[PDB]
């Protein structure tokens, strides 16, 4: 029940043979370190209070690692450019999601290593941590190369050692919840139609479900709803709306499901 991920982006930029490289670390989906090559002195930086106890050796080893990753992604971008026979004056994107899950028995639960090129899946390590899945024939070049070099075994060694070790260390510090405050607003829409908007504000985590019923029956089909969005103050907002006949508003109920709620909230106009 615990996770560490690294999300990496490399962006090849027209002009200057150096592409931009960003790396973001997360523990339990909370961002805890960040590296960005666009800084004056690019270096990994703490993003969680509990990372300020590490000390300079940690930061310099990790920064050196990210400067290596910057060179690795630069070369991989050039390789891929060649595989697809693309031009060199463009901007191109390589992405990376990787890391581990730590189970209740303190063992490696699952490992992850997948890449995307231009926002599309390219190659991923399979659950067995032994084989690769390639999206197209260019990714099959890369997959032949990584089978040749035994890449999966080396990464499995990282997963079973350094990854779960540092995840455990981080967990030995870095667990909060905030129920939504919900209300229904009313908006004249068409001539004899109105919009009921069901709002959920001020909740954490961001996972939530808003539903509209007409005397118990779910209206999911003809329901408009916006992506959950950050208030910018730690909490989140969402709304779902339906269009109803003017005068019938009281036959419609909104139902809000959220972790911190002792029971799902039900609301009306």
């Amino acid at each position, epitope marked *: 029940p615990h996770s560490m991920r690294y999300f990496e982006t490399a962006v090849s930029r027209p002009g200057l043979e150096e592409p931009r490289y960003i790396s973001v670390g997360y523990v339990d989906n909370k961002e805890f370190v960040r590296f960005d090559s666009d800084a004056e002195n690019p270096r990994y930086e703490p993003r969680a209070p509990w990372m300020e106890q590490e000390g300079p050796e940690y930061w310099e080893r990790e920064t050196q690692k990210a400067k290596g990753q910057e060179q690795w992604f630069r070369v991989s971008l050039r390789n891929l450019l060649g595989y697809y026979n693309q031009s060199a004056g463009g901007s191109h994107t390589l992405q990376q999601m990787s890391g581990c899950d730590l189970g209740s028995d303190w063992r490696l639960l699952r490992g992850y290593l997948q890449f995307a090129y231009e926002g599309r899946d390219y190659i991923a390590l399979n659950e067995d941590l032994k084989t690769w899945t390639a999206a197209d024939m260019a990714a099959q070049i890369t997959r032949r190369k990584w089978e040749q070099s035994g890449a999966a075994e080396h990464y499995k060694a990282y997963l079973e050692g350094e990854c779960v070790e540092w995840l455990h260390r981080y967990l030995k510090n870095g667990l909060r919840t905030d129920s939504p405050k919900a209300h229904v607003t009313h908006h004249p829409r068409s001539k004899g139609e109105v919009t009921l908007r069901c709002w959920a504000l001020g909740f954490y985590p961001a996972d939530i479900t808003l*539903t509209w*019923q007409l005397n*118990g029956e*779910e209206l999911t*089909q003809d329901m408009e709803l916006v992506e959950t969005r950050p208030a910018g103050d730690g909490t989140f907002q969402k709304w779902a709306s339906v269009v109803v006949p003017l005068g019938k508003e009281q036959n419609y109920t909104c139902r809000v499901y959220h*972790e911190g709620l002792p029971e*799902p909230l039900t609301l009306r106009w």
Partner: antibody, heavy 116, light 108 residues
Framework: SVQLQQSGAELAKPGASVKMSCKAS????????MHWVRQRPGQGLEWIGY????????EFNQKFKGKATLTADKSSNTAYIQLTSLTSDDSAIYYC?????????WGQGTTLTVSS | LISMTQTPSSLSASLGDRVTISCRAS??????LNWYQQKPDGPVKLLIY???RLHSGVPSRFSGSGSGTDYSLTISNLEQEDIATYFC?????????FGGGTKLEIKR
């Protein structure tokens, strides 16, 4: 015109794990929760948990926390339940079912037998 | 977890009868009460949701009623295809919970 097609009968050794699938057709897969329900031979229905395929979010009946893992593949419109450390207690029928506080539509069920 | 009790586990009826199956929750569930039918062979279908609402497809001889902590399903004219097992389920507080059973059988 909603259909939930579940994968076929499983059978597995004690201590292994299984993955069973439920493919959703006829409706937008990510707009409804998928629930999982267990019935042991001769027993009633027990609720396992649900997954919200939009986000991958999962919630469980506390007794299945260390037993079941729920996942969704929206490119293929398919939910999955994985059970680990199988014992003879896990032999049962497993259904997937759509919606939120009621279960609109049920898969046909996947039978799992745990035997050496 | 909210406890759903049905009584009994077996009900005997004859074809043409008005069968009633009852469900009792350990606390008030605000009509978020649903009824499923499991046929002897396997398939499970929703019959009644939200105490009294007939799911589409379900013949109108199925009716649902109740409030607070007591709920009931009635079939007004028991047909052969109605000989099945019937489950109640509360949708009020997590975890969702089912009643135990009530299986129907012909009288002879």
């Amino acid at each position: 015109s909603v259909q939930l097609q579940q994968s076929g009968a499983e059978l597995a050794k004690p201590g292994a794990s299984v993955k069973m699938s439920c493919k959703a057709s006829g409706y937008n897969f990510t707009t409804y929760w998928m629930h999982w329900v267990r019935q042991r031979p001769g027993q009633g229905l027990e609720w396992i948990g649900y997954i919200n395929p939009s986000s991958g979010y999962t919630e469980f009946n506390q007794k299945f926390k260390g037993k079941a893992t729920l996942t969704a593949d929206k490119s293929s419109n398919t939910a999955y339940i994985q059970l680990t450390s199988l014992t003879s207690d896990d032999s049962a029928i497993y259904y997937c079912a759509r919606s939120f506080y009621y279960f609109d539509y049920w898969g046909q069920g996947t039978t799992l037998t745990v035997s050496s | 977890l909210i406890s759903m009790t049905q009584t009994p586990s077996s009900l005997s009826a004859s074809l043409g009868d008005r069968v009633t199956i009852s469900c009792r929750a350990s606390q008030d569930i605000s009509n978020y009460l649903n009824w499923y039918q499991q046929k002897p062979d396997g398939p499970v279908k929703l019959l009644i949701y939200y105490t009294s609402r007939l799911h589409s497809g379900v013949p109108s001889r199925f009716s649902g009623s109740g409030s607070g902590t007591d709920y009931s399903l009635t079939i007004s004219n028991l047909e052969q295809e109605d000989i099945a097992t019937y489950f109640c389920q509360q949708g009020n507080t997590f975890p969702w919970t089912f009643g135990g059973g009530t299986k129907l059988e012909i009288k002879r």
